Design a protein around this ligand. Structure first.
Ligand SMILES: C[S@@+](CC[C@H](N)C(=O)[O-])C[C@H]1O[C@@H](n2cnc3c(N)ncnc32)[C@H](O)[C@@H]1O
Ligand SMILES: C[S@@+](CC[C@H](N)C(=O)[O-])C[C@H]1O[C@@H](n2cnc3c(N)ncnc32)[C@H](O)[C@@H]1O
Ligand SMILES: [Cl-]
Ligand SMILES: [Cl-]
Lengths: 442, 442, 268
């Protein structure tokens, strides 16, 4: 009888599915986590076009497993306590059309035995801290990496060191240390455990998909360090830029988080409303919240200029500078400037034409834009002290201009006629050269 | 003043008896435990015919002690904190007609000093885990055995390892390990501690009485292993069979608990409504709940057959088999059969007449009852390969019968005429002998 | 060294090399979690299995199953006899399937090979579930159709001079229409009194598929037991099975032993 099986549970951790007579006894009601988990189930099931295979690690009394099997999922639940599995099975038998199997076993061994594709979704709620406590953080990171490797999505509720108990001392400084080796992760909620006032964060993690409520797609590769608070995911015709505002440990000062926030916000604003006369990459999706923000754009051909420079690839500096200057002059005509023109913000296509790819540093108002013209000289010099004729003549001509006349329209016009300009080396000069050379060091 | 004494309490653990101004401050309200404890007090006081002497171990602020003294109990409360005892005494003085004494002291030393008969009831609520933590499980088991030895009843609320605190690690795997050496125990409730979502079980324990709400009687001996989930208590004219459905540790699989449940349930059903033509032992009391079930029956004279066989006692196999077969044939005539006729289910009285004593295996419907007739041959053989004439002739005659004719009426009729039946050894036979001999091995 | 890799799905020893540090060579392994990588057959698989129903592994791809037997295993794992039996069964299975008897639909063979360490066989993938799984997972089964279909194929084998030494639930696959077929031919044999022992085990099979026999299955078995033993064979077993509804009622006879001998066998 169920009555007996429930009584022999060492703990009624969860609601007993279908049996509200024990709801008052359950340590956690599970309705809040279930609301969120079912939402994520539906998103992923919608994206894949079918009911999911779900793995429930440390499934306890089966509540999540049964609740998802109720919605048509095929589920396997694992727990190392016989009493828990006995209850799960008895509950499944009350619901014979549910495709639900349960097994006694250890999560460590199950994870090792998993095969990719066997399960679409795995859930591991409030169980990994037990594995951390016995086996350490590094083994748990590797288990979670494998779990992510073999599924499409993982949902974790993770206990945290701020919980007032003795086992908190063995926890990592931040729960994200268990998952940050995985490609994609997002905080999706925080839950009351009824053990203390400290809530546990729930994360959605994937090694194969961008999983954003509005955009759910496989990616084939990703990158953290461009050219660690920013991640880029590459899919067939998209790039997803994912910025963390909230990072663990020291990592971001207050100012840096706000700048991450500012840049991504500014980039969204610009790309959703780009200026006429400028071909901006197209925007497929975007959103922001307290922890992070994201932007999905059309994927552009070409390579990042800084990579090409580093990997000594052959470049046409004339075509790169011409194309870039043309776009900067067109921005300026619409009252837009870019505050940070550097090789890692520039992409060069197969025909050696260049374009900006980060619009975080775009600005709309201001003497000005004189400083930006100055840096652009450094850019130029780093792209190559190092300027042959007629690039040196171009820079010399600009320096002879009254400063109120420095702007990108002028920079472009002089660039286009640089072959006609007088020879700098024939003049006393000589300072423009030395100031930028010191700038280009500085 | 009471105000000062209460303030100097390191903790207001309990309601301050008579002083509801501190009820909001009390860690535990105590009303739920008190409701249950008073019920048990009344049962035992009713059974003994008088007010009880009660011992309250780790009595804290005296709530249980005073509440029972209010109902006419004579109480002694023990606690090792002076501040707690000061409050208890001040409260007792506000209630001068209560027969209540309080002493500072250690439970370990008090238990050692107890004399049998001094107290009828001892209560030890949420205190033994402190003794486990400092002295270990084995010393605590011995203290609890002595406590049970010297009282009529013990009520314990026991902390458990699932509680989230550091001291949980020192607790036994299951709280029943502290008490299972005692003769009689029953779970009577589970209580919220307000420290966590994990409740503490309350047990009623005795080394001298069966304490079931409907049946409250001394017993003079008891037994676990017949001939450990089943216990038998023997009193003057009764035997109480007590089956645990819920057992600690691995001990019972789900199927085994259900079979314990099934057998005891089936036995109750049969004995409360026995078939005409069959003398069944009489039923004095019975009940079942999630954890266990019990049945109190009239006590039958005689010895269990398997004991007599083991202790090589002299037996009359003719009279045993005759009497048993007669009762089996009468059952069968009423549409009843017994699925498990074995020596440990048979009792033999002084005149060598035998009867069944376990009706867990009784069944009412089904080719059949051919299998049961087959086992009965094994029974027969074990009661003695080993069959002399005319027992061998009896079995041979049965084997020559078409199988649709095998039943206990036939078995009995052939048994009664076995001296007239043809000699098996004069026939080719020979197989019935070898099949049962292999069965009787198997 | 295999302890570092045996958790991976597919592995094969491909050579052994002199290190010039000592006379002890180092093995080179080819390992994959995604493909069967056999020189003749190189294909993705989508799942794999070790324990059927650990020296044998099965890889499942879109229209194939690859059976991979280790003859050479680490540690204690295989005695000499067991390795040779792995070798024998896989060899025997290859021989049978590459040259199957007329009158028997055998799964088709896509690739195969053997060497010192292991042997492999890639076959067409058959629909259905393994009978022992269905029994374990209490799935609904039609014992009439399973036994009928299986007996028909066994009788046809026998007519071609072939028998199967090990008819058990884990060697039988049942399709959606409840028709059954053998899927392991390691235990096929060609010569021998006989095939009387095999007929006997088939009764156990029958009983485990359900002591436990209702009419007319019990009548069928009783009829077989009344036959002189030189007449026991699968053609007879099949013929009596097809007419079992007409056969006399066993419970009306003294019997009774055939029942008890198989019940003890079915324990044993
Ligand atoms: C704190 S409970 C969480 C239960 C459930 N996941 C939930 O949050 O509602 C941890 C569960 O995981 C199980 N567990 C802990 N370690 C395990 C392991 N190594 N393998 C399988 N189950 C494990 C326990 O038996 C227990 O049921
Ligand atoms: C957790 S409180 C339980 C109080 C009370 N029995 C109740 O549950 O309402 C434990 C009490 O036992 C007392 N105590 C602990 N160890 C003791 C010992 N060895 N001897 C006497 N009292 C003890 C403490 O002073 C404290 O008042
Ligand atoms: Cl966790
Ligand atoms: Cl306790």
């Amino acid at each position: 009888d169920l009555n007996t099986l429930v009584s022999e549970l060492p703990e009624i951790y969860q609601t007993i599915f279908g049996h509200p007579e024990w709801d008052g006894d359950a340590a956690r009601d599970c309705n809040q986590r279930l609301d969120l988990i079912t939402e994520q189930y539906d998103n992923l099931s919608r994206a894949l076009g079918r009911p999911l295979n779900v793995l429930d690690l440390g499934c306890a009394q089966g509540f999540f497993s049964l609740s998802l099997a109720s919605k048509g999922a095929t589920i396997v639940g694992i727990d190392f306590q016989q009493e828990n599995i006995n209850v799960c099975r008895a509950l499944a038998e009350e619901n014979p059309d549910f495709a639900a199997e349960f097994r006694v076993g250890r999560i460590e061994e199950v994870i090792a035995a998993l095969e990719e594709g066997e399960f679409d979704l795995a859930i591991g709620l409030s169980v990994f801290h037990h594995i951390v406590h016995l086996h350490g953080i590094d083994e748990v990171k590797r288990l979670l990496s494998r779990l992510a490797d073999v599924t499409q999505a993982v949902i974790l509720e993770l206990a945290v060191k701020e919980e007032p108990f003795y086992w908190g001392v063995s926890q990592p400084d931040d729960p994200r240390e268990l998952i940050e080796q995985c490609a994609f992760y997002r905080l999706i909620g925080e839950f009351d455990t009824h053990l203390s006032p400290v809530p546990r964060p729930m994360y959605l993690v994937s090694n194969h998909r961008v999983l954003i409520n509005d955009f759910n797609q496989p990616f084939q590769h990703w990158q953290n360090q461009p050219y660690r608070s920013r991640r880029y995911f590459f899919g067939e015709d998209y790039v997803c830029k994912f910025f963390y505002y909230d990072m663990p440990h020291g990592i971001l000062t207050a100012e840096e988080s706000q700048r991450n926030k500012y840049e991504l916000h500014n980039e969204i604003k610009f790309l959703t409303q780009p200026p006429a006369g400028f071909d901006a990459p197209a925007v497929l999706a975007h959103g922001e919240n307290a922890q992070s923000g994201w932007l999905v754009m059309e994927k552009l051909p070409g390579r990042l200029l800084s990579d090409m420079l580093a990997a000594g690839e052959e470049i046409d500096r004339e075509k790169i500078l011409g194309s870039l200057l043309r776009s900067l002059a067109a921005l300026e005509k619409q009252g837009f400037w870019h505050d940070d023109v550097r090789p890692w913000n520039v992409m060069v296509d197969a025909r050696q034409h260049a374009r900006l790819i980060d619009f975080g540093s775009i600005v709309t108002t201001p003497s000005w834009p004189t400083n930006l013209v100055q840096s652009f000289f450094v850019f130029v010099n780093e792209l190559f002290f190092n300027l042959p004729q007629p690039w040196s003549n171009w820079l010399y001509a600009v320096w002879q201009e009254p400063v109120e006349r420095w702007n990108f329209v002028l920079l472009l016009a002089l660039f286009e006629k640089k072959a006609k300009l007088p020879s700098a080396e024939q003049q006393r000069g000589a300072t423009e050269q030395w100031i930028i050379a010191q700038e280009t060091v500085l």
